[PDB]
Design a protein around this ligand. Structure first.
Ligand SMILES: *[B]([O])([O])[C][N]C(=O)C1=C([C])ON=C1C1=C(Cl)[C]=[C][C]=[C]1
Ligand SMILES: *[B]([O])([O])[C][N]C(=O)C1=C([C])ON=C1C1=C(Cl)[C]=[C][C]=[C]1
Lengths: 358, 358
C-alpha cells in the first residue's frame, strides 16, 4: 500500500494492540474506494495460527448493520413498511402495550424500553412470544432510545416473514450473495472452521453461544476482505445492481431519530462530518451507548447524508469489531479483533487513521 | 403504433373532444416504456393552427410535480430537509403561528389551511411576506390536507434558497436539462411563441396571467413530447444518470400522508394499484379535490411503491391537463388540452385507456 496509509495504520494499531493486549487483529482501510489490508498476531494462540485476510471474526453487533440493510431491502421490495404495527406480522402479540409500537420503533430501539439482552431462559419460540407478551414498557413508543438486541432482533425476525424465507436464507440470498460476501456466515460451515478465529476473554478461548435472536442481533462472522466489500457497498450503494438492495442500503443510512449529536439509522448510527472526535470517542463508551436517552423524531427521516461519519461498534464475549466510513470522502475503515477491548480505544484509533487520510 | 393502442385511444379520446368541445388536444401513451403520440384540433383557432407535437400547453397544477421533484432533488443534495422549520429558509417569517410548520407541511398542503390561492393583489416580495405573516391557521399543522397553491408554491420558493439559484434557474438546470426537456418552459421565450397554444375559456383565447408563486405552483408550459419524457422519467427513475435527480423523483413518490385511499407525495398523488376507478374519477371532482380532509401521517414515509397509480390533474383558466402512470407496468398517459374541462372526464378517459393496456 501507499506509504502514507501503511505508516498511519501501523503507528496507530501497533500501540493499540500492545496497550489492549489484543491477541490478533485485522484492519482494512478503504481509500479512494480501494481496500488495503493489514494483519497482526494470532487467530488461535494455542495452535499458533496467525490472523490472515481469510480469518473469520465474530462481528457481534456490527451484524445489526446487515439486519438493518436486509430490513431496508424488504421495505424496498414492498414486503413490509416501517410504519406497520408490530402486530401486523406477529398477530399472536395481543397484549395492549403493543398498540402503537411499529417496526420502526423495533428497528431503532425506541419501542419503550425493550431490554438489551433477551433472557438466557428464553429459547423456544413459545418462550419468545411469552417474553414479548409479558414485557412492560417504561416509556411511550418513540420517546426514548435504549440500545437493545431484543428490539432490533425482533425487527429482523419480522422483516423477513412475508418472504417466507428463514432469516439466514434471506440474508444469504438478498444481501451476502449479491454483494459477493462469500466468506460471511451466520452459521460457520465445517469447511470454513479452520479459518474461524477463537475469541479471548480473561485469557480463555471462547466462541459465541447460541441465543434467541442471535442471528438477527449479533451472529454474523466475516473476514476482513468481506467486511471491506461491505464498507465499499455502503459507501457507494448506487454501484449495486440489485435495485431493492441499493435502496435498502440507502434506507439503513437515513436519519430517523436524534439523540445528542448522533442520528439513528437501521443498524448504522451516523453523525455529521466533520465530527468532533471527543464526541464519537466518548460516545462509544458503553456508559453512554447503552444508556436510556430521550430522542427527537426526524419527521420525516432525512435521506442518507453523504457528509456523515457512519459507524457501528460490535462485541461478543471474545471479540471486538468496529466499522466506520465517510461517504463524501470514499473513505472507510474496518477493525476486527479477537478480544472485546474498550469501544473508545477503537474509535480513537479509527479517527486518527481516517482523519490523517483527509 | 400497435393497433391496440390506436383503437382504445381513438375510441376514448375522440368522443371526449366532441363531448367537451375541446379545441385542441395532444395525448401520449407510454406503453412498455415507449411513447405513442396523438394530436387533434387547433392550438390557435383563429389562425387555424393545428395542435402538433411541438405545441406548448399550460400544464397548470401538473407543474406541482416538477416543483415536488425539484424539492426532492434539493433534499437529496443535502441542501434542505423536509423536517426543517419553514423559518430556517425564511428568517423574516417570525410570526408565532409558523412555529411548528415545516417544509413537509408546505409541500403536502398540511400546514393548517394555507389558502387555495394567493390573493390576486399580492404581487411584491413585501406583499408576500405580509401575506404569510398575517395568515392565521384553520387547523394545527399536520392534521388536515387542504390543496393549495400558497402551500406548495412557498415550498418551491424556499426549497431552492440554499442553492442560491432562482426558482426558474434551479428548475432548468436541475430538472429540465438533465431530462432533456428541451421544449419545457416556466417563461416561454420568443422563439417558442409560435408553438404556444392559446387556452380557451367561454370562447375567448387566453393565457395564464402573472401571479405570486405562479412558476412554483402552476406555471410550467410543455409539449406532449417532453411530457412523455417526464412520465418515462418518473416511471423509471433508476435510468436517470444524475444521482440526486434520480433520488428526488423517488422522494416525490414517497407516501407522506394518507386520506382515504389516496397518499400524498411531493406534487404527485398516489393510490395502490389496482385502483378503484370510481374513487379516482369521483375523487378528482373539485368538490372533493379542493375540500379539507383529515390526514394520517405515514411514519416514516413509505418509499415509492411500484404497484401504484401515480397522478396529478392540472388546470389554468384556459387549459386542462392530466398525467397518470403505473411504475410496475411501465405504463402511463399524458393528456393536454386547451380548454379547462371537468377533471372526472379526464380521469375516466385515462382509466379506460390504461386499464385496456394492462
Ligand atoms: B452488540 O455487540 O452491541 C451486542 N452484544 C451482545 O449481544 C453480546 C454478546 C452476544 O456477548 N456480549 C455481548 C456484549 C453486550 Cl450484551 C454489551 C456490550 C458488549 C458485549
Ligand atoms: B392547479 O391547476 O390545481 C391550480 N390551478 C390554479 O391555480 C388556477 C389558475 C391559474 O387558473 N385557474 C386555476 C384553477 C383553480 Cl384555482 C382551481 C381549479 C381549476 C383551475
Amino acid at each position: 500500500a501507499p506509504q502514507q496509509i501503511n505508516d498511519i495504520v501501523h503507528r496507530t494499531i501497533t500501540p493499540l494492540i500492545e496497550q489492549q493486549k489484543i491477541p490478533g487483529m485485522a484492519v482494512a482501510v478503504i481509500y479512494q474506494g480501494k481496500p488495503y489490508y493489514f494483519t497482526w498476531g494470532y487467530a488461535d494462540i494455542a495452535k499458533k495460527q496467525p490472523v490472515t485476510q481469510q480469518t473469520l471474526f465474530e462481528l457481534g453487533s456490527v451484524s445489526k448493520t446487515f439486519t438493518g440493510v436486509l430490513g431496508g431491502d424488504a421495505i424496498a421490495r414492498g414486503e413490509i413498511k416501517l410504519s406497520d404495527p408490530t402486530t401486523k406480522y406477529w398477530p399472536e402479540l395481543t397484549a395492549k402495550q403493543w398498540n402503537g409500537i411499529t417496526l420502526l420503533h423495533l428497528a431503532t430501539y425506541t419501542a419503550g424500553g425493550l431490554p438489551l439482552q433477551v433472557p438466557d431462559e428464553v429459547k423456544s419460540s413459545s418462550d419468545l412470544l411469552r417474553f414479548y407478551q409479558n414485557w412492560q414498557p417504561a416509556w411511550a413508543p418513540g420517546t426514548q432510545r435504549l440500545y437493545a438486541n431484543s428490539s432490533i432482533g425482533l425487527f429482523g425476525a419480522l422483516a423477513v416473514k412475508p418472504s417466507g424465507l428463514s432469516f439466514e436464507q434471506a440474508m444469504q440470498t438478498r444481501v451476502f450473495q449479491p454483494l459477493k460476501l462469500n466468506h460471511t456466515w451466520i452459521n460457520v460451515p465445517p469447511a470454513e472452521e479452520k479459518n474461524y478465529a477463537w475469541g479471548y476473554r480473561e485469557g480463555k478461548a471462547v466462541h459465541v453461544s447460541p441465543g434467541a435472536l442471535d442471528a438477527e442481533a449479533y451472529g454474523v462472522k466475516s473476514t476482513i476482505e468481506d467486511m471491506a466489500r461491505w464498507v465499499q457497498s455502503n459507501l457507494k450503494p448506487l454501484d449495486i445492481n440489485e435495485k431493492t438492495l441499493q435502496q435498502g442500503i440507502q434506507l439503513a443510512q437515513s436519519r430517523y431519530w436524534q439523540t445528542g449529536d448522533m442520528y439513528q439509522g437501521l443498524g448504522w448510527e451516523m453523525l455529521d462530518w466533520p465530527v468532533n472526535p471527543d464526541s464519537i470517542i466518548n460516545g462509544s463508551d458503553n456508559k453512554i451507548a447503552l444508556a436510556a436517552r430521550p430522542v427527537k423524531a426526524i419527521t420525516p427521516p432525512t435521506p442518507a447524508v453523504r457528509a456523515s461519519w457512519v459507524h457501528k461498534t460490535g462485541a461478543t464475549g471474545g471479540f471486538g469489531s468496529y466499522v466506520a466510513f465517510i461517504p463524501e470522502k470514499e473513505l472507510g475503515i474496518v477493525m476486527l479483533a479477537n478480544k472485546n477491548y474498550p469501544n473508545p480505544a477503537r474509535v480513537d484509533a479509527a479517527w486518527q487513521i481516517l482523519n490523517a487520510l483527509a
